[PDB]
Design a protein around this nucleic acid. Structure first.
Ligand code: MG
Ligand code: MG
Ligand code: MG
Ligand code: MG
Ligand code: MG
Ligand code: MG
Ligand code: MG
Ligand code: MG
Ligand code: MG
Ligand code: MG
Ligand code: MG
Ligand code: MG
Ligand code: MG
Ligand code: MG
Ligand code: MG
Ligand code: MG
Ligand code: MG
Ligand code: MG
Ligand code: MG
Ligand code: MG
Ligand code: MG
Ligand code: MG
Ligand code: MG
Ligand code: MG
Ligand code: MG
Ligand code: MG
Ligand code: MG
Ligand code: MG
Ligand code: MG
Ligand code: MG
Ligand code: MG
Ligand code: MG
Ligand code: MG
Ligand code: MG
Ligand code: MG
Ligand code: MG
Ligand code: MG
Ligand code: MG
Ligand code: MG
Ligand code: MG
Ligand code: MG
Lengths: 339, 122, 46, 240, 393, 179
RNA sequence: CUCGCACACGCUUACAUCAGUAACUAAUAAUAUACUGAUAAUUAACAACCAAUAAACCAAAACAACACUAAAACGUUUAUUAAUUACAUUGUUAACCCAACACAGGAGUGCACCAAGGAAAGAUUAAAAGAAGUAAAAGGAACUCGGCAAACACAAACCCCGCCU
RNA sequence: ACGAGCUACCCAUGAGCAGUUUAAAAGAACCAACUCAUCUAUGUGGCAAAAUAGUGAGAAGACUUGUAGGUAGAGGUGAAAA
RNA sequence: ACCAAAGCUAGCUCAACAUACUAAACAAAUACAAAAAUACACCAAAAUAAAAUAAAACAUUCACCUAACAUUAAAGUAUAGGA
C-alpha cells in the first residue's frame, strides 16, 4: 500500500523536527557521553594523517587533471565525490593499523539503504474508503556515499531504558504540508546488503551533500538557519533507516521490539564542511498499537557543522582543523566489545 | 463523445501534454537537463520609497474635478519644444537640420526604451 | 460480440484526426472550417 | 500519407544497421506486392558489391585482403564474409569454401598469361581461363556486382571475342560484357540452401511470408507447359 | 559503384529558379516586400544570413581546420573504447614489445608464500564473489554493470586489509578518470594513446625492474610478427586535431608520482558492447605502455634512448568472472626503428575466478539439485591478484 | 510587512468604513511621472488589501464592509493607466509618428477574412523561420464563394434590422398620435 | 460473501467541509459518493518538458558458462563547439472510463489472495405453472432425430471426410 | 466531403505466458492466468441492439495484448465467408 | 372541481431605395494537440461538371442547371433534332 517517501536530503524548511516526529527521535546537541573506559590507544600520528588527508584534498582540487569543463562552475559534487571516496579508503587502512576490525570490514560505495515502517493512524479523508482508519506508512530509499559494515555489533552509548527530560516534537499538520508525497511501490528493508551476508552491522556512514543544498545556494534563498537543519535531517533519516534495517535483520520488529540498543555513526559533508552524528535506535515499535504504553525513545547526537580546510590555493591547503580529523578518528576507532 | 466546447488545457491531456497557463519563460534547458534561469529575463520590480511622501489612494470629496482635456501630441509640443524653438528663432540661431537640442530623436535604435517597436512592458 | 462501445477515447487520436491544425493543412479541411463559420457554429473544430 | 524509406544512410559501415520492413506497401500506403509481412526483426549488413575498390586513390595497384569471419545473413540467401585490408573492413559475399583466417586477392590487372584461379579471387573477365566458374558479375565496368549473387549459384565464362567476354547466367541465358569487368571466381556460399526443408507453415511466417489467398481462380491459357527456344543473348556492349 | 544514399531521402534540390531571374537587366518582383509567401509573385533569393553579433550556441559548427591545434599529419589515437582487430599482435607491434606466457617469477614467489594469504582466504573470497554477484543488490539477479566494479573493488579491499602486516601499502593512493596523453612516433606512423582508464592505483615509490639482463638481450634478437594484409593502425582513430605533449594525469610535484596498477573493467550488459578477451588484453597493453612512457619521458626527457632504468607498470582486467593479468617493463624510448631492444610484457590470460554462478536454486523434478552460489572456485586467480597488489612490498 | 494586506485593526468589525472619491483623470494629468509611479504603488497595496477583505468576507458568509471602495480604487488605477498611456502615445507620435505601439500589418488569412495581424519578436529573420513560413496569408480561389456568402448574410441581417426599426416607429405613431 | 491497492489511458470537480432536502437525482425509502446551496481544495523529490557533428566498435536476449536459428529492442568512449546565472513551466481531487441508465457487458500494466474490499433477503405467506439445485425404491437408454441433458461413470473399438497446429 | 478511436491487414514501439511433464520453449503433452466461443439451458422491450450459468477448445505460438502511425468507397482489406 | 383554456407581443416575410459589399470587437493569446512570448527554412498546385430525369424501354439527344445585358416586338418564326 500507499506510503510517504522520506528523502534524507531535503529542501523542505524544517525537516529535522518533522523527521524526528516520523521516527520518534530525540535530538541532543554535542557528541554522546565519552566512554572513559578507553585504553591508552592514541599513539596516533597526527602528521601522517594530516599528510594522508591533504594528499586527497590536493589530488582532487589541484593535481588531477579532468577533461576540461566548459562550465568552469566546478560542480562541488564532481569535485568532492572522489575526494570523499579517497578520504574513506585512505583513513580506513591507516587507522586499520590500530583498529584490526577495519581489516575485516566491507566498504560500500554508493549502494542503497532501504527502510520501511509504520507510524501513527489516520482517518482517511477522501475516496470510497473515506472515514475508515489506516496507519501512516513511510519509506526511506537512501544512497550513502560510503559505508563500513562489520561482523559484530558496536557498543551502546547509553543503556536501553536511558531517559531524557526532552520530548519528541509533535507536529500539528499532515506530513503533506512539509511537503511530502505519497506513492506506492515495493516496500524494502535493506541494509546495504542482503540477509545472507555475514556482515550484519553498521559502523559509520558517509553522506556527501547534493548540489541543491550548498551553503551558498541556501544563503541566496534567505535561509540562514537551514544550513544546519539540512545536516540534521539527513542524519536523522539515514542513520535511523540504517539502524532500523540492521535491527530487522536480527529478527526484531514492531511486536518483537528490541532487546539490545542498535547503534551507528555518520558523517555528513559538503566537501568543505563536516558534521558528526551518532544514532541509537531503541524502539522499533512506532506502530499505533505498539506505541501506546511504550516509554522508550530513539536518540540522536550531533555536532555543529564545521570546516575541514580553509581555501585551498595552488597545491597548498591553507587553513586546517585537526579537531575535525580527531573526531573522524574517534568514529573510526570504535570497536565491538571483546569476549 | 468527448468534449468539444470546454477549453483545451494541460489538465486534460496525457502525460506528454504540458501547456503553460501563460506565464512567461524565465530561462532555457541546460546541459545536465537541469533548467537554467537567466537573471535578465526575470522581471525586476522597480519600487520607489513611499514612506516620505503624501498622497493617498482616495481623494477628498469637496476637492474639485476639472475640465477634461485629453493630452494631444500638439499640447505636448507646445509645452516643451515651442518655448525653446521660438526662443532660438527669435535669436536667429534656429537650425532646421539638427533639432536634437529641443528633444527630437531622429532614430530609436540607440536608446534603452524605444517608443515604436516598444522595448519595455510597463 | 457485443457492440456500441465503438468509441475508445484518446486525446491524441482526437486532436490528430479532427483538430484545428489537421483541418487547416488540406484545402478540403479549410472548406470544412469555412462551412462551419458560415453556419455560425460555436466550435469550428475539436 | 507519406512514409520515408529506411534506406537512407550515407557512410559505409560494417556494423549492422537497423531497418524497417514494410509488408508489400508502397510509400502511399497501398499494397503493391501481396503476401509480405511480419517476419522476425532484422538488422541489415551493408555489402560492398564492387569487389575491386582501392582503399586510397593514391595507390591504384591490385590489393589483397584477409578474411576474418564468415557469418550468416538474414537478408540474403548466401553466407557473407567479413574482409579486412589496410585500415578498412567490408562485407563481401562469401564463396563456397571461404573460411576464417584466409587470404583473398582483388585485382584489376589483365595479362597475356591469364591466371590460376583460387576461390576468393576477383579478376577482370578477360584475365580468366575460358572454362572458369564466376559469381558477382558486373555488367558495365565500374558499376558493381548485380548478377549471380544468390546462394550456391555459379555462372560460367563461355568465351572471349573482340576484347569482350561472353558468360552463361544461372538461368542458362548468355550475357555479353566487356572483358574489363570484374567477377569473383567460384560458387557462392551455402550450396545446400536448395535442399532446406521448411517444416511447418509457422516457419514460413518467420520468413515474413503471409499465406496465399483463399480465392479460387480457374487456370487460364497462360497455364500449361510452354517450350520456348532460349532467348537471344543480352549484350551490354555499346557499339559505336 | 553503388552509392549509399537514396534520392527520396536526400534533402530536396532547390526549386528551379523563377524564369524572371533569367532575363538580363530586369528587376523581378517578389513577395519579399510583404514578408510572406504569395502565389503570383516570384520567389525571392536571400543572402546567407549574418547576425552581426555571434551567438555561442546557435552558430554553425566551426570547420575543423580553423582550430589552433589543427595539423596536416594524420595521427592515430588509441582511446579507452577502441577495439584492435588483431589484439595482442597489433598491441605488441605498436608498442615494440615481446610477449611471455606466465607472470614474472618474482610475483609468483610473492603469490605462493603461505605468509601472504589473508585470514581465511577461501571463506573471504567466496564471500566477495557471492556478495558482488548476489547480495549487493535488492534485485534477484544483478546486472554486470553493477557487479563488475563491485567485485574488483571487493578484491581490492581484501588485499588492502594486508596493510597491517606489510605497512608499506599506505604509500599508495587510488585515482579515477585521469587524462592520459602519450604521443610517440613509430615507423613513420604517428601514434597517441589518449584518454581515460577507469581506475589507477598510484604509488609513492617506483617498482623494481622484473627482468634479468639475459631477458633484455634475448629481446634484442626477437623478430616482431607481422600481419600482412592488415595495417597495424587498424582499429584506431584517424585524427587531424591533437596535441603532442607528454601528459600523465597529474601536474608537477605530485606526491604519488609512480603508476602502479591500471584496472580495466568491462561493464556492459550486452555481449557486443564488451571486449573480446583478446581485445581487452590489447587495450591494457597499450594503456600500460602509455602510462609508462609518460613517466619515462618525465624522469629522463623527450630524447629517444634505451633505458638504463626500466619502468614497470601493471594492469588487470575483467568480465567480472574472468581476469586478465599483465605486467609491463618499458626498456626503450626510441620506437622509430624496428631493430633495437624491445620492451617486455608478461600476460597471464583467461584466468577464471569462478566457473558459473547461481542466484536461484536450480530445481529438477521438484528436488533441489544445484544450490545457490558459485560453481568451482580458483584460489589461484585471487592469489595472482594478491601478488600483483603486493608487488611493491 | 504582512499587515498591509489588512485594514487598521481599528476598522475590523465595523459595517461602514468611509472613504474618499476615486481619482479623476484630470487631477492625475497634473502630477509628474515620478508621483504617478508612486501613487501606483499606494493604490496597489490598497487594492490588494481590499481584495483580501473581499474573499474573507465571502468565507465568513458576511457582507463586505463598504464594498464601494473596491470600485473606486480600481477606477483610480484604471484612470492612472489611461493617463500614463496618453503621455506615451502622444510622445511616440512626436518621435516616430506611428499610432500603434506594436508593429502590425493588414493581411488576408486562409479564410479570406481581412485580419489585423500583430507581429511577434523572433531571433531570426522571417524567411528562415519554419513555423511562421507555414502560415498562409492569402486565400485560395474557392474561398471567394464563401466571402460572397458572408456579405450577403451580413446584408440580410442589416436589412431586416432596418425594417424592424421602421416598423416600430409606425406602431408607436398610431399608439401615441400626439402629432 | 470475496476482483483488492496503485499506475497508464480516459473522465473533468461528479471529490472535501458545513447546511438543506416539500419537489427535483437514486428505478423505493431511511439518508446522501451521486440531487440543492454555500465554503474550501491536489504544494515536487514522482512525471512531462529536458544537445548537436565527426570517430572507433563483425561478435544476441535466454540466471549466460556457451550455444541454437527465425539471426535478434536496449551505448560506451575520443574529438569539436554546447548561453552558465538560487527559486522555470506544467499533471497531482474522486466512489471516475466505453456501453442512451448509479447497465450481471467491454477495458492495459505492477503487486497482492487479505491485513484489503463487500451484502444474496423492503415485510410476509409457503397455492399452481416457470427457473436453479440436492436426493431417490426396482430397472438401467426401454427416452430420443440423436445417451440431447444429467451421472457414484470420466473407458475401450470401427468407419467417412480432412494429413497435422 | 467526412470516416481505419469498431473491425480487416500492415508499420513502428512496448508488455505478458505461472505450475507439471520432457535430452527439448518440439506450430509435442497436462493444466491456470490469458485468448477464444463447442453444446445445452436460461434470457428474447432481456443484466445485454448477442448477455448469464454450466460445459467446452488453444494456452512459447501462424500466441495474446497496450500505445502511436498507414491504406478510403469506380476504393481499401481479405488463411474467400462475397 | 382538477387537468386545462384565453390573450399580443417577440420578431419575421416580401419588395423599394441606397451607398457601393466580408458587421461588431481586439489588451494579451491564437495555424505545437488553434488560443502555449523566444531558433537556420523550404514552399506550394491545376484536368470539360455528372447523373437522377424526359423520350412512356434505352443506347444519339433531354430546356433551367452558380458563366452579367435588361425591356417591347420580330417568334415559338429561320433553323436544330434516334428530323
Ligand atoms: Mg459531441
Ligand atoms: Mg496532461
Ligand atoms: Mg492522466
Ligand atoms: Mg530549478
Ligand atoms: Mg454509436
Ligand atoms: Mg529478406
Ligand atoms: Mg541466409
Ligand atoms: Mg502457393
Ligand atoms: Mg486455392
Ligand atoms: Mg461523461
Ligand atoms: Mg459533494
Ligand atoms: Mg426518491
Ligand atoms: Mg489519486
Ligand atoms: Mg423482494
Ligand atoms: Mg413450484
Ligand atoms: Mg426441478
Ligand atoms: Mg443427483
Ligand atoms: Mg433410481
Ligand atoms: Mg430406441
Ligand atoms: Mg420409442
Ligand atoms: Mg453431453
Ligand atoms: Mg461416455
Ligand atoms: Mg463411457
Ligand atoms: Mg482439418
Ligand atoms: Mg487502429
Ligand atoms: Mg509455462
Ligand atoms: Mg502445445
Ligand atoms: Mg461461458
Ligand atoms: Mg448443471
Ligand atoms: Mg472455463
Ligand atoms: Mg486443453
Ligand atoms: Mg490438444
Ligand atoms: Mg490511423
Ligand atoms: Mg455500376
Ligand atoms: Mg474491391
Ligand atoms: Mg466460396
Ligand atoms: Mg426514360
Ligand atoms: Mg411516367
Ligand atoms: Mg427504366
Ligand atoms: Mg444535364
Ligand atoms: Mg441530320
Amino acid at each position: 500500500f500507499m506510503k510517504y517517501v522520506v528523502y534524507p536530503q531535503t529542501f523542505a524548511l524544517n525537516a529535522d523536527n518533522w523527521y524526528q516526529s516520523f521516527t520518534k527521535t530525540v535530538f541532543l546537541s554535542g557528541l554522546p557521553p565519552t566512554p572513559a573506559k578507553l585504553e591508552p590507544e592514541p599513539t596516533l600520528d597526527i602528521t601522517a594523517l594530516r599528510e594522508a588527508v591533504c594528499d586527497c584534498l590536493l589530488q582532487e582540487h589541484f593535481f588531477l587533471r579532468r577533461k576540461k569543463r566548459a562550465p568552469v562552475i566546478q560542480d562541488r559534487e564532481a569535485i568532492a565525490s572522489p575526494f570523499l571516496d579517497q578520504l574513506v579508503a585512505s583513513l580506513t587502512g591507516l587507522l586499520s593499523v590500530h583498529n584490526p576490525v577495519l581489516a575485516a570490514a566491507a566498504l560500500d560505495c554508493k549502494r542503497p539503504v532501504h527502510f520501511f515502517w509504520l507510524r501513527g493512524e489516520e482517518i482517511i479523508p477522501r475516496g470510497h474508503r473515506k472515514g475508515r482508519v489506516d496507519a501512516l506508512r513511510y519509506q526511506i530509499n537512501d544512497k550513502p556515499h560510503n559505508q563500513i559494515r562489520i561482523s559484530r555489533q558496536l557498543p551502546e552509548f547509553v543503556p536501553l531504558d536511558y531517559s531524557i527530560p526532552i520530548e519528541v516534537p509533535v507536529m500539528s499538520c499532515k506530513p503533506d504540508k512539509l511537503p511530502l508525497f505519497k506513492r506506492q511501490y515495493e516496500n524494502t528493508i535493506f541494509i546495504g546488503s542482503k540477509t545472507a551476508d555475514p556482515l550484519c552491522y553498521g559502523h559509520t556512514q558517509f553522506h556527501l551533500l547534493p548540489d541543491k543544498l550548498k551553503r551558498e545556494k541556501l544563503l541566496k534563498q534567505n535561509c540562514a538557519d537551514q544550513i544546519e537543519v539540512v545536516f540534521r535531517a539527513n542524519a536523522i533519516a539515514s542513520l535511523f533507516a540504517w539502524t532500523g534495517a540492521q535491527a530487522m535483520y536480527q529478527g526484531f520488529w514492531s511486536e518483537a521490539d528490541v532487546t539490545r540498543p542498535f547503534v551507528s555513526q555518520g558523517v555528513i559533508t559538503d566537501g568543505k564542511y563536516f558534521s558528526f552524528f551518532c544514532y541509537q535506535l531503541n524502539t522499533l515499535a512506532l506502530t499505533a498499537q505498539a506505541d501506546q504504553n511504550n516509554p522508550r525513545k530513539n536518540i540522536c547526537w550531533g555536532t555543529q557543522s564545521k570546516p575541514l580546510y580553509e581555501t585551498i590555493e595552488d597545491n597548498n591547503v591553507k587553513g586546517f582543523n585537526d579537531d575535525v580529523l580527531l573526531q573522524l578518528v574517534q568514529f573510526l576507532l570504535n570497536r565491538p566489545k571483546e569476549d | 463523445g468527448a468534449d468539444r466546447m470546454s477549453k483545451w488545457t494541460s489538465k486534460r491531456g496525457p502525460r506528454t501534454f504540458c501547456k503553460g497557463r501563460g506565464a512567461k519563460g524565465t530561462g532555457f534547458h541546460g546541459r545536465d537537463g537541469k533548467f537554467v534561469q537567466i537573471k535578465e529575463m526575470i522581471p525586476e520590480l522597480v519600487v520607489p520609497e513611499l514612506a516620505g511622501f503624501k498622497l493617498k489612494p482616495y481623494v477628498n470629496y469637496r476637492a474639485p474635478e476639472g475640465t477634461d482635456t485629453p493630452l494631444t501630441a500638439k499640447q505636448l509640443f507646445l509645452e516643451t519644444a515651442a518655448p525653446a524653438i521660438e526662443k532660438d528663432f527669435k535669436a536667429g540661431t534656429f537650425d532646421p537640420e539638427h533639432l536634437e537640442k529641443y528633444g527630437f530623436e531622429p532614430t530609436q535604435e540607440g536608446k534603452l526604451f524605444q517608443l515604436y517597436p516598444k522595448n519595455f512592458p510597463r | 460480440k457485443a457492440r456500441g462501445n465503438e468509441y475508445q477515447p484518446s486525446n491524441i487520436k482526437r486532436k490528430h484526426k479532427h483538430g484545428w491544425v489537421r483541418r487547416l493543412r488540406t484545402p478540403t479541411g479549410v472548406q470544412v472550417i469555412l462551412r462551419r463559420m458560415h453556419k455560425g457554429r460555436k466550435s469550428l473544430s475539436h | 500519407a507519406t512514409s520515408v524509406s529506411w534506406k537512407s544512410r550515407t557512410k559505409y559501415t560494417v556494423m549492422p544497421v537497423k531497418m524497417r520492413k514494410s509488408g508489400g506497401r508502397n510509400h502511399t500506403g497501398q499494397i503493391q506486392v501481396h503476401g509480405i509481412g511480419g517476419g522476425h526483426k532484422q538488422r541489415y549488413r551493408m555489402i560492398d558489391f564492387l569487389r575491386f575498390r582501392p582503399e586510397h586513390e593514391s595507390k591504384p595497384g591490385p590489393f589483397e585482403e584477409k578474411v576474418i569471419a564468415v557469418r550468416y545473413d538474414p537478408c540474403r540467401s548466401a553466407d557473407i564474409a567479413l574482409v579486412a585490408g589496410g585500415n578498412r573492413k567490408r562485407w563481401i559475399i562469401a564463396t563456397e569454401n571461404m573460411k576464417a583466417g584466409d587470404t583473398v586477392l582483388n585485382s584489376d590487372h589483365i595479362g597475356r598469361m591469364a591466371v590460376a584461379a583460387r576461390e576468393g579471387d576477383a579478376h577482370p573477365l578477360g584475365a580468366l581461363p575460358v572454362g572458369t566458374l564466376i559469381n558477382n558479375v558486373e555488367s558495365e565496368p565500374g558499376r558493381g556486382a548485380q548478377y549471380i549473387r544468390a546462394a550456391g549459384t555459379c555462372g560460367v565464362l563461355l568465351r572471349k571475342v573482340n576484347g569482350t567476354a561472353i558468360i552463361q547466367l544461372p538461368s542458362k541465358r548468355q550475357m555479353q560484357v566487356l572483358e574489363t569487368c570484374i567477377a569473383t571466381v567460384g560458387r557462392v556460399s551455402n550450396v545446400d540452401h536448395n535442399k532446406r526443408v521448411i517444416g511447418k507453415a509457422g516457419r514460413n511466417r518467420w520468413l515474413g511470408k503471409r499465406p496465399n489467398s483463399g480465392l479460387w481462380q480457374r487456370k487460364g491459357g497462360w497455364a500449361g507447359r510452354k517450350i520456348r527456344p532460349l532467348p537471344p543473348m543480352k549484350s551490354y556492349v555499346k557499339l559505336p | 559503384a553503388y552509392e549509399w544514399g537514396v534520392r527520396s531521402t536526400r534533402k530536396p534540390e532547390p526549386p528551379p529558379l523563377d524564369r524572371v531571374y533569367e532575363i538580363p537587366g530586369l528587376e523581378p518582383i517578389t513577395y519579399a516586400g510583404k514578408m510572406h509567401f504569395m502565389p503570383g509573385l516570384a520567389r525571392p533569393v536571400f543572402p546567407p544570413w549574418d547576425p552581426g553579433w555571434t551567438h555561442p550556441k546557435f552558430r554553425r559548427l566551426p570547420p575543423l581546420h580553423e582550430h589552433p591545434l589543427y595539423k596536416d599529419q594524420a595521427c592515430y589515437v588509441f582511446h579507452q573504447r577502441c577495439r584492435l582487430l588483431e589484439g595482442v599482435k597489433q598491441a605488441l607491434w605498436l608498442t615494440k614489445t615481446q610477449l611471455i606466457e606466465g607472470l614474472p617469477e618474482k610475483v609468483l614467489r610473492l603469490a605462493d608464500d603461505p605468509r601472504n594469504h589473508i585470514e581465511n582466504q577461501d571463506e573471504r573470497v567466496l564471500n566477495a564473489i557471492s556478495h558482488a554477484r548476489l547480495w549487493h543488490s535488492t534485485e534477484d539477479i544483478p546486472k554486470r554493470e553493477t557487479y563488475c566494479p563491485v567485485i574488483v573493488d571487493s578484491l581490492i579491499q581484501l588485499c588492502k586489509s594486508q596493510i597491517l602486516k606489510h605497512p608499506s601499502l599506505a604509500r599508495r593512493i587510488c585515482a579515477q578518470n585521469n587524462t592520459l596523453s602519450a604521443t610517440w612516433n613509430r615507423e613513420s606512423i604517428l601514434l597517441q594513446v589518449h584518454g581515460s582508464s577507469g581506475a589507477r592505483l598510484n604509488a609513492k615509490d617506483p617498482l623494481p625492474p622484473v627482468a634479468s639482463q639475459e631477458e633484455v638481450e634475448a629481446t634484442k634478437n626477437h623478430v616482431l610478427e607481422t600481419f600482412y594484409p592488415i595495417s597495424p593502425t587498424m582499429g584506431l582513430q584517424e585524427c587531424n586535431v591533437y596535441d603532442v605533449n607528454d601528459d600523465t594525469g597529474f601536474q608537477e610535484g605530485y606526491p604519488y608520482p609512480c603508476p602502479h596498477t591500471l584496472y580495466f573493467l568491462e561493464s556492459a550488459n550486452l555481449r557486443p558492447r564488451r571486449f573480446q578477451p583478446d581485445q581487452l588484453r590489447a587495450k591494457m597493453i597499450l594503456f600500460a605502455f602509455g602510462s609508462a612512457l609518460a613517466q619515462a619521458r618525465l624522469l629522463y626527457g623527450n630524447d629517444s634512448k634505451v633505458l638504463e632504468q626500466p619502468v614497470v607498470v601493471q594492469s588487470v582486467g575483467t568480465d567480472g568472472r574472468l581476469f586478465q593479468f599483465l605486467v609491463l617493463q618499458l626498456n626503450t624510448t626510441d620506437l622509430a626503428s624496428d631493430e633495437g631492444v624491445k620492451n617486455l610484457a608478461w600476460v597471464d590470460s583467461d584466468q577464471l575466478l569462478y566457473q558459473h554462478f547461481w542466484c536461484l536454486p536450480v530445481i529438477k523434478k521438484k528436488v533441489v539439485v544445484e544450490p545457490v552460489g558459485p560453481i568451482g572456485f580458483q584460489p589461484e586467480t585471487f592469489r595472482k591478484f594478491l601478488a600483483l597488489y603486493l608487488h611493491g612490498a | 510587512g504582512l499587515e498591509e494586506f489588512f485594514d487598521d485593526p481599528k476598522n475590523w468589525g465595523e459595517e461602514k468604513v468611509k472613504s474618499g472619491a476615486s481619482w479623476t483623470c484630470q487631477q492625475l494629468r497634473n502630477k509628474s511621472n515620478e508621483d504617478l509611479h508612486k501613487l501606483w504603488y499606494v493604490l496597489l497595496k490598497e487594492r490588494n488589501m481590499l481584495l483580501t477583505l473581499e474573499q474573507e468576507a465571502k468565507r465568513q458568509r458576511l457582507p463586505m464592509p463598504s464594498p464601494e471602495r473596491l470600485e473606486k480604487v480600481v477606477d483610480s488605477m484604471d484612470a492612472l493607466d489611461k493617463v500614463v498611456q496618453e503621455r506615451e502615445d502622444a510622445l511616440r507620435l512626436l518621435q516616430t509618428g506611428q499610432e500603434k505601439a506594436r508593429p502590425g500589418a493588414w493581411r488576408r488569412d486562409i479564410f479570406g477574412r481581412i485580419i489585423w495581424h500583430k507581429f511577434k519578436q523572433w531571433p531570426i529573420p522571417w524567411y528562415l523561420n519554419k513555423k511562421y513560413n507555414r502560415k498562409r496569408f492569402f486565400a485560395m480561389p474557392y474561398v471567394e464563394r464563401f466571402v460572397r456568402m458572408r456579405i450577403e448574410k451580413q446584408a440580410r441581417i442589416k436589412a431586416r434590422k432596418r425594417s424592424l426599426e421602421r416598423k416600430k416607429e409606425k406602431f408607436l405613431q398610431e399608439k401615441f398620435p400626439h402629432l
